[PDB]
């Protein structure tokens, strides 16, 4: 609509529920009164990919591949339930996989931090930045139920020609149950590390690397000796350098030490395990609503940013009960400031690069003013304890915000 | 030696470096002095596994189907580093996946709590206790590595030998990774889900399953349909008397949850989430030392005790090095006492029950009077803080626990 500078080529990719409500009024009010985008958008709203058979979620893909550029909104992920909800053709597989699985690299999670929003872990002093290999495992395995008694293997043929390679999972003598498969491959593996010493060196910041090698010793095996190997030839005299260091830990022993430790380090994590402690990180220093997520390509020019949480469906069933939200708008601000950047470092556009961070300065500067959403509040005195003075709902704070920015670019103009 | 109360029959399973250490301090100490037990002995040591072909291992199992009750010491399992260090013929593979393969059954893991010692995680005023699914998955998987271009499938067979239907894994076409296959069983799952809806029931408290079924459709929608199913015909009714309920959620929601919860709840989890999970609640509460771990099989009837943690291997260096160490021994000694208050249990023994838990407050007693390790006295001061005059080192302690029980099944006498 009414835009001023110039912001260049954007990959926009709508979501769903409350998420996607909340993505309108940023674009409406926080972006497109001050930027002039050439925009890119593809609706990856659950009705759209029904529709298009999910061939929208693969041409957003391959059009970040080309303008180099993506922010995305939360999307949801169906399974038999959602199938009956929307009436869906099929039981659609999450975009994000999608995404990740054509594009590659790795998702950096962190949260953001705000001086007077207290943590439920007493000590994280500095903060936690989490690498999770974006490829592979659970995210692209094949699983099915097993109706009965019979038996389930796994083979291999080589392209070299030699014999097939043949392995018993299991002789199910007397009932059913389930079986999967799963994979991955080492240049992809290669580039985790590659990504995961270099942050940590960009940082000045230790890196830890957690895996379950004692029990998947072949699978799990080949994470830790690529890493060891790429460390021990390319990197580990330049993390003595700056004095850090790289360490190997069993995932039971890293999330306990993560748990009492200061914070202050990199944490190389595989796809699940990166999937399910950013949540628990997130949650940690205060709020789903408040970390960024990117995903770094390894080109090193392409790049996603999005959201880590969900559509937050819990908030929108009392949103269509006509009760009253207070949905943290943050994580999803931070996605277009994250993206809108690395488009300006791209472009060397000294005016969008001011932008993108006039706004996330206007963000925390609100909060920590004393303006934030029920989550945050609850923060700060207990959840037990908070009353309605203490926030602003969903769209109050949108308000706020839009106010705050607005006069931040007028006083930086005047 | 000296020995009073008749115990009856029990399997012990010695294990390895400073776990082995604090093993033996405990039965010399704490349990031969006042009870005679029928131990049917087997030693897990790495070193006699090896020199068994890991035969003990089996053996160990197969002796707590028919004595039903068993008190393991936390075990190595050995990767490549091991192999070379211990000179091994083969990486065996973890004994706890082969003793729990053979029981079956659900592992409950709960933090041993003491009024003095502050948590990590401020909300948690509660007791949170997880049921580990104990069988199958990543703990009794196929996994290889794959040495360059070729595919790779998992096939299903009937038991008649009629069909035959292949899935595809992947194709590689450009190098070499890995790949994997892994399953379960209904009946299994069916145990599994019954034992977690029994112990909602027996302490009043809701119950939540989580798994990743937008993600794994078939492998996990098979746990979640199965858990629904048992619930909405045997236990619904029940749960609504007591006005506790049951939900399902993803991984992601559900660690978050826990980490902003008071506790109270029961936490149904797969076996790598339970895991990986209850290290990283122990911390929290405030030391992996502080936790039990108990396998309750199917039967209702056979129970193998043991500590949740592993041998200690970074105190063990220093323990080697002739240095000075301060490790807690407590998870191991509950490993010994709900493993002989089992076996009251089964037998009515009115004595041993009394022993069992006389030495549980004894722990307790002693540390909340001001006398414990190191982990637990940087609970209270901060860990930059504590000086060597705040705890005791691992013998100190036993000795300092040995006394104190001394006294109090004087004064249970006299
Ligand atoms: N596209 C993605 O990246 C992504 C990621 C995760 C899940 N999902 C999808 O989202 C749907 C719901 O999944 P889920 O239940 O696990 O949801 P979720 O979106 O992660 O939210 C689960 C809970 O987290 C809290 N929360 C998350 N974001 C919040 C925010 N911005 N402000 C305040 N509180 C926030 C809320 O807790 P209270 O209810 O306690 O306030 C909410 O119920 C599913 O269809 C799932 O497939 C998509
Ligand atoms: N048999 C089992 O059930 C079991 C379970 C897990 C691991 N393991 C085995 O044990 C070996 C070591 O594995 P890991 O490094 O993951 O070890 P671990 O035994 O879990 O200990 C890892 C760290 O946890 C803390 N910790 C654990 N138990 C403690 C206690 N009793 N008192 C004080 N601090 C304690 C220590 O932290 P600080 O160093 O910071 O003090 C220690 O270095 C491996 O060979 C593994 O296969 C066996
Ligand atoms: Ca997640
Ligand atoms: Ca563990």
Known sequence: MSKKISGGSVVEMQGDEMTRI??????????????????????????????????????????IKKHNVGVKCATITPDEKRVEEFKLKQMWKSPNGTIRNILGGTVFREAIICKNIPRLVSGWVKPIIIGRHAYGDQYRATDFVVPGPGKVEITYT???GTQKVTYLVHNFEEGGGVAMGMYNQDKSIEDFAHSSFQ??????????????????????????DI?????????????????????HRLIDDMVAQAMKSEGGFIWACKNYDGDVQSDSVAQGYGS???????????????????????????HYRMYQKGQETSTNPIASIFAWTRGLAHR?????????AFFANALEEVSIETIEAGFMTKDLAACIKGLPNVQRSDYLNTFEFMDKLGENLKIKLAQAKL
Chains 1, 2 share one sequence.
């Open 288 to 314: 789903l609503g408040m970390m960024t997520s990117v995903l770094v390509c390894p080109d090193g020019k392409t790049v996603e940013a999005e959201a880590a949480h969900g559509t937050v469906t819990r």
């Open 22 to 63: 909340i993505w309108e009024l940023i674009k409406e009010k926080l972006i497109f009164p001050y930027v002039e985008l050439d925009l890119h958008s593809y609706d990856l709203g659950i009705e759209n990919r029904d529709a298009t058979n999910d061939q929208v979620t693969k041409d957003a893909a391959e059009a």
């Open 199 to 224: 942050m940590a060196l960009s940082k000045g910041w230790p890196l830890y690397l957690s895996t379950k090698n004692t029990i998947l010793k072949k699978y799990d095996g080949r994470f830790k």
């Open 158 to 160: 080589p392209s070299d």
């Open 344 to 352: 300006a470092k791209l472009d060397n556009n000294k005016e969008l």
């Open 227 to 247: 890493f060891q190997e790429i460390y021990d030839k390319q990197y580990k005299s330049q993390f003595e350098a700056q004095k850090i260091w790289y360490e």
